[PDB]
């Protein structure tokens, strides 16, 4: 039975994650009781994303600071995750006429305001190599970023530029790290490691 990774999941991540997720999964016919390696995969990616864009802004003067909210500062990044394939589809298409940057054939998790560019986004429970190279492949739009972590506290990134400061990955990954770790407590790790 899945029961005990459901249950890991609902209290590893706050609610509004666990709603994305299972909205997700029941527009494509996905069941989160039964396949709960998914439902985890999916809540991962989805508080990767948030975390990646939290507390980075341009302000007034046009230019990207870190906050831990004022009124004419906007959004560092947009989010492109969490929508459903119209309004995602709708968000692109607004950036293209905002920023005049190419349409990416395929939707990527963000976009960056200050480097103009959109990010794909990849958390791999396998090697962070031999995962950005699938994902390269599988893209082969040099238009679009890469960005994979890793739970073991590792992270590959295209040209080797990591786009946000040293802080803010360093919080990801640990916190990566530490669900890895509360998993292999439960020794629910190896199963969720196995099914990707
Ligand atoms: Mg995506
Ligand atoms: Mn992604």
């Known amino acids: ?34 396949e709960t390696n998914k439902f985890a995969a999916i809540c991962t990616h989805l508080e990767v994303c948030f975390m990646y864009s939290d507390f980075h802004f341009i302000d007034e003067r046009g230019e990207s600071i870190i906050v831990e909210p004022n009124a004419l500062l906007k959004h560092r990044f947009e989010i492109i995750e969490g ?4 309004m995602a589809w709708t968000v692109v298409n607004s950036i293209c006429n905002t920023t005049g ?30 995962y950005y190279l699938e994902k390269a492949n599988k893209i082969k739009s040099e238009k679009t970023h890469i960005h994979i972590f890793s739970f073991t506290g590792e992270e590959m990134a295209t040209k080797a530029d990591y786009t946000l400061d040293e802080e803010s990955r360093a919080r990801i990954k640990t916190r990566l790290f530490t669900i890895r770790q509360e998993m292999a407590s439960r020794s629910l790790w190896d199963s969720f490691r196995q099914s990707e």
């Open 101 to 130: 940057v190419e349409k990416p054939k395929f939707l990527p998790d963000l976009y960056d305001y200050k480097e103009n560019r959109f990010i794909e986004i990849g958390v791999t429970r396998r090697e962070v190599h031999i």
């Open 1 to 34: 039975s899945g029961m005990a990774m459901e249950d890991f999941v609902r209290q590893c991540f706050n609610p509004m994650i666990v709603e994305l997720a299972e909205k997700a999964m029941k527009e494509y016919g996905e069941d989160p009781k039964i």
């Open 83 to 86: 929508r459903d394939r119209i």
